[PDB]
Swiss-Prot record, chain A:
It comes from Saccharomyces cerevisiae (strain ATCC 204508 / S288c) (Baker's yeast). This is Pre-mRNA-splicing factor 8. Component of the U4/U6-U5 tri-snRNP complex composed of the U4, U6 and U5 snRNAs and at least PRP3, PRP4, PRP6, PRP8, PRP18, PRP31, PRP38, SNU13, SNU23, SNU66, SNU114, SPP381, SMB1, SMD1, SMD2, SMD3, SMX2, SMX3, LSM2, LSM3, LSM4, LSM5, LSM6, LSM7, LSM8, BRR2 and DIB1. The MPN (JAB/Mov34) domain has structural similarity with deubiquitinating enzymes, but lacks the residues that would bind the catalytic metal ion. Residues 7-237 are annotated as: RNase H homology domain. The gene is PRP8. Functions as a scaffold that mediates the ordered assembly of spliceosomal proteins and snRNAs. Required for association of BRR2 with the spliceosomal U5 snRNP, and the subsequent assembly of the U4/U6-U5 tri-snRNP complex. Functions as a scaffold that positions spliceosomal U2, U5 and U6 snRNAs at splice sites on pre-mRNA substrates, so that splicing can occur. Interacts with both the 5' and the 3' splice site, as well as the branch region. Has a role in branch site-3' splice site selection. Associates with the branch site-3' splice 3'-exon region. Also has a role in cell cycle. It is found in: Nucleus. Present with 468 molecules/cell in log phase SD medium. It comes from the Eukaryota. Transmembrane segments: none annotated. Disulfide bonds: none annotated.
Curated annotation (Swiss-Prot), chain B:
CDD domains: Aar2_C, Aar2_N. Present with 7330 molecules/cell in log phase SD medium. Keywords: Cytoplasm, mRNA processing, mRNA splicing, Nucleus, Phosphoprotein. Heterodimer. Interacts with PRP8 (via RNase H homology domain and MPN domain), competing with BRR2 for the same binding site. Component of a U5 snRNP complex that contains at least the U5 snRNA, PRP8, SNU114, AAR2, SMB1, SMD1, SMD2, SMD3, SME1, SMX2 and SMX3, but is not a component of the U4/U6-U5 tri-snRNP complex. This is A1 cistron-splicing factor AAR2. InterPro entries: AAR2, AAR2_C, AAR2_C_sf, Aar2_N, AAR2_N_sf. Changing S236 to D/E: Disrupts interaction with PRP8.
């Protein structure tokens, strides 16, 4: 059934599963035309497919050309996400195919389910969590590789860098969601926090700075304080 | 005109014949129903005074034989049976008429209701849904489950309706995932019409039979099946013009005939708002739409 706070640790057990988030699959800018009408221009997008246990990220880049001559693009985007997730699964050896796929938006259930008809033992589930995966394009290296692409392209990352060498999946995922949540609520501040100190660098094969254990504690506290501040501002509390 | 005599009526029961029904009192001298119009199927059904649960009944066609009702006190219910002795049967019938112990099938001559509800229903098709090939009539009751329900126990008692499922390999061509799921025309016309039902009349026959089983026995699987077959049509962008117009007529007399008080369990809110207002065929059910609004605006 649905994923929520009660069954949260199931994400870190040894059943293979993937989160699919489609929020950055169809991306537009909105502008005015010479005649004064509004028009959209699409830009490159991405399906965010993540194994929360291992950190393996399957970044499928959605080139604008996919939309050419198509209608009801926001509807199509759900089916293109499902078509690309299913092809991903088909591409993996049997022992690596997920037992569950958790969609971060319920509108994805019917498209994926129809595309996974060939995999009846792969359970497609919704979730009640309010995961911040839309902020994935706030990670500079992910946004860069999306925006630069000239064709459909899959790019593989470990979204946890090397954290698992020292912390558990559970803790890794809580760091990831906390960082992304901060980036979502106030990108400019969040990014300031991460990079203030030029002496802490991002390895070329990594997405996030190489903080020491102590420095992650300070970071995480700074990210928490950010999120709470923005809340009082939002609601006047 | 044909007759279905009854040996006796030992227990207080409400008896139905098609859309008509009569209360019969414990050991009241009731001995059958006469003047039953030849040419369509019929259904005679029962609800004991003591057990307002399990409505049951028998689908039959008088052309296929002489049929009578007899209470079985072991099994506790009115059983339809066939008399093979033609002479012995006209004898029982004529004597009961003589003594005038029979109700007349109460058809007003202006009334095409039963024809409009059973236009495409064939006794041969019914007996393939209710497989029991040692009888020429078919038993149905409140509790009987459908083959599709059983998949998600006893097959001898199963309603073998055609399985429709929008999220199945059958319904969805590889490569046309999105297309086929948003526009079921290929499931309807190629898979179901051309493939399985062979023509629109058998399709419509199963649709009507399903509806009647829901109305008369509150059979929930039949209600599910009726809605499914409506949805399949309404969710197809490409339907023969003759099917659309006939569907409007079919549904009109179904909505017309339904007891006002049962609209809550027998009408699936999603399916109807989808068919009447969202689907491809929204504009193609004018009579059905008009009668639904004037009689059940709440559901909508």
């Amino acid at each position: 059934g649905a994923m929520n706070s009660s069954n949260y640790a199931e994400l870190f057990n040894n059943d293979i599963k993937l989160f699919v988030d489609d929020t950055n699959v169809y991306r537009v800018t909105v502008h005015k035309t010479f005649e004064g009408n509004v028009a959209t221009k699409a830009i490159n997008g991405c399906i965010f497919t993540l194994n929360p246990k291992t950190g393996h990220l399957f970044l499928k880049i959605i080139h604008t050309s996919v939309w050419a001559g198509q209608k009801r693009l926001s509807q199509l985007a759900k089916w293109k996400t499902a078509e690309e997730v299913s092809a991903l699964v088909r591409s993996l050896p049997k022992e690596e195919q997920p037992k569950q796929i958790i969609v971060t938006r319920k509108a994805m259930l019917d498209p994926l389910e129809v595309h996974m008809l060939d995999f009846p033992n792969i359970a497609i589930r919704p979730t009640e969590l309010r995961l911040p995966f839309s902020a994935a394009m706030s990670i500079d290296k992910l946004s860069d590789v999306v925006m630069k692409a000239t064709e459909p392209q899959m790019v593989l990352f470990n979204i946890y860098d090397d954290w698992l060498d020292r912390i558990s999946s559970y803790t890794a995922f809580s760091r990831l969601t906390l960082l992304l949540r901060a980036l979502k609520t106030n990108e400019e501040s969040a990014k300031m926090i991460l990079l203030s100190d030029p002496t802490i660098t991002i390895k070329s094969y990594h997405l996030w700075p190489s903080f020491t254990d102590e420095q992650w504690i300070t970071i995480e506290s700074q990210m928490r304080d950010l999120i709470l501040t923005e809340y009082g501002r939002k609601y006047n509390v | 005109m044909n007759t279905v005599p009854f040996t006796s009526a030992p227990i207080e029961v409400t008896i139905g014949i098609d859309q008509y029904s009569f209360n019969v009192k414990e050991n009241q001298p009731f001995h059958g129903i006469k003047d039953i119009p030849i040419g369509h199927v019929h259904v005679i059904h029962f609800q004991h005074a003591d057990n307002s649960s399990m409505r049951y009944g028998y689908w039959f066609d008088c052309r296929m034989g002489n049929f009578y009702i007899q209470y079985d006190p072991k099994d506790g219910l009115y059983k339809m049976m066939e008399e093979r002795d033609g002479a012995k049967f006209e004898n029982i019938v004529h004597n009961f008429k003589e003594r005038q112990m029979m109700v007349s099938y109460p058809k007003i001559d202006e009334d095409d209701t039963w024809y409009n509800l059973t236009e495409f229903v064939q006794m041969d098709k019914i007996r393939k849904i209710v497989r029991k090939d040692e009888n020429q009539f078919s038993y149905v009751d409140s509790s009987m489950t459908t083959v599709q329900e059983n998949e998600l126990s006893d097959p001898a008692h199963s309603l073998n309706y055609t399985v429709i499922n929008f999220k199945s390999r059958e319904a969805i061509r590889p490569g046309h995932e999105m297309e086929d799921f948003l526009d079921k025309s290929y499931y309807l016309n190629t898979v179901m019409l051309q493939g399985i039902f062979k023509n629109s009349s058998n399709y419509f026959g199963e649709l009507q039979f399903a509806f009647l089983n829901a109305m008369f026995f509150g059979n929930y699987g039949s209600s599910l099946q009726w809605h499914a077959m409506i949805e399949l049509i309404c969710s197809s962008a490409t339907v023969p013009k003759h099917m659309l117009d006939k569907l409007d007529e079919i549904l009109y007399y179904q909505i017309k005939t339904l007891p006002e008080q049962y609209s809550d369990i027998l009408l699936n809110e999603r399916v109807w708002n989808i068919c009447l207002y969202s689907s491809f065929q929204k504009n193609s059910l004018h009579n059905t739409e008009k009668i639904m609004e004037n009689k059940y605006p709440e559901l909508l």
